[PDB]
Amino acid sequence: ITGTSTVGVGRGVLGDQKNINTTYSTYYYLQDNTRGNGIFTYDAKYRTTLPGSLWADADNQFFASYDAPAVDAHYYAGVTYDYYKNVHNRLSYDGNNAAIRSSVHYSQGYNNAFWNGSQMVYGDGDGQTFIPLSGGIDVVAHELTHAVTDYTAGLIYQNESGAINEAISDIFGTLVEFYANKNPDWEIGEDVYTPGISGDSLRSMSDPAKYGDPDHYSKRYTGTQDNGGVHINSGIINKAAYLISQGGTHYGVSVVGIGRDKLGKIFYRALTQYLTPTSNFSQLRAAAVQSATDLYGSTSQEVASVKQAFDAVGVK
Ligand SMILES: [Ca+2]
Ligand SMILES: [Ca+2]
Ligand SMILES: [Ca+2]
Ligand SMILES: [Ca+2]
Numbered sequence: 001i002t003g004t005s006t007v008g009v010g011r012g013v014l015g016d017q018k019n020i021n022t023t024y025s026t027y028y029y030l031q032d033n034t035r036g037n038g039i040f041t042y043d044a045k046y047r048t049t050l051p052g053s054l055w056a057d058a059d060n061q062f063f064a065s066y067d068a069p070a071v072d073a074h075y076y077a078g079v080t081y082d083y084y085k086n087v088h089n090r091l092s093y094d095g096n097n098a099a100i101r102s103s104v105h106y107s108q109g110y111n112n113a114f115w116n117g118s119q120m121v122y123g124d125g126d127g128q129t130f131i132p133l134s135g136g137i138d139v140v141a142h143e144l145t146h147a148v149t150d151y152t153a154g155l156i157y158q159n160e161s162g163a164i165n166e167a168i169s170d171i172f173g174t175l176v177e178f179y180a181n182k183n184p185d186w187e188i189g190e191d192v193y194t195p196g197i198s199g200d201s202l203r204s205m206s207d208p209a210k211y212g213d214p215d216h217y218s219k220r221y222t223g224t225q226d227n228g229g230v231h232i233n234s235g236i237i238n239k240a241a242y243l244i245s246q247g248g249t250h251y252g253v254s255v256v257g258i259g260r261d262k263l264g265k266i267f268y269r270a271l272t273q274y275l276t277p278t279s280n281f282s283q284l285r286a287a288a289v290q291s292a293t294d295l296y297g298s299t300s301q302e303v304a305s306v307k308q309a310f311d312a313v314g315v316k
């Protein structure tokens with residue numbers, strides 16, 4: 001909408017208070033005009049029609065329980081935008097400040113969230129498996145990262161290239177969570193998953209096997225479920241990324257860590273420069289080695305550590 005930029009206040013899914021950029025014209029809309037061509041958040045009203053209605057509020061205060069998923073989808077999209085801009089010099093998902101659209105209250109008791117090719121979509125969860133999914137900063141940045149991928153590598157969402165797609169979203173969702181400095185960790189979805197159980201999550205990058213995911217190529221899922229294991233085989237790549245950053249020994253292979261900033265630089269360069277729609281794990285290793293080479297030199301510790309991390313998870 002046309003209007004004036006304003007700033008409201010509300011409470012997120014986890015009961016945390018935060019300011020949000022809005023736009024005023026009769027109502028206050030969840031429309032942040034300060035980031036690129038804007039960040040717009042919509043009410044799907046428990047339906048699956050998209051995007052729904054642009055979120056409108058009478059007083060610019062967002063403290064109703066119904067407001068909570070909208071507050072977080074809107075706020076965390078801005079944080080993710082800031083991450084990509086300040087860290088990678090990237091302006092929104094297309095690199096040209098494309099408007100970012102999200103819808104919340106998608107369907108009834110929907111235990112998921114996704115990037116659909118045009119926008120982000122968040123369920124509220126059924127209250128047992130999940131609370132509203134936009135409540136997780138890693139979840140929001142994971143979905144938004146699918147958009148980055150769509151516009152760069154274009155990784156097909158199937159088999160090894162789909163597993164890499166997933167891993168890329170997990171890696172950058174985590175890097176955004178650390179950038180925000182909000183109880184950061186190497187788990188995925190811990191803030192929104194199973195409100196009745198503390199300390200679990202959907203996926204672990206530091207130890208994927210904790211939740212049944214492979215941490216070595218020899219243990220890869222070879223069947224057809226989950227698009228050929230895109231959220232399962234992502235474990236092998238998530239583990240490699242974790243090792244590159246934090247180091248460690250894994251299957252008797254030692255890795256010297258080079259930190260989160262360099263992991264981010266190396267994988268962003270890989271994603272934007274070398275990966276293709278049909279890249280497999282072997283090609284991701286080559287892409288990451290080439291990227292580390294471009295950035296730090298071929299005899300660098302950074303290049304050595306990438307090779308070691310990929311060796312550790314059995315990817316040559
Ligand atoms: Ca209000
Ligand atoms: Ca966390
Ligand atoms: Ca996390
Ligand atoms: Ca839990």
Ligand SMILES: [Zn+2]
Nearest residue numbers: 142146166169
């Ligand atoms: Zn995903």
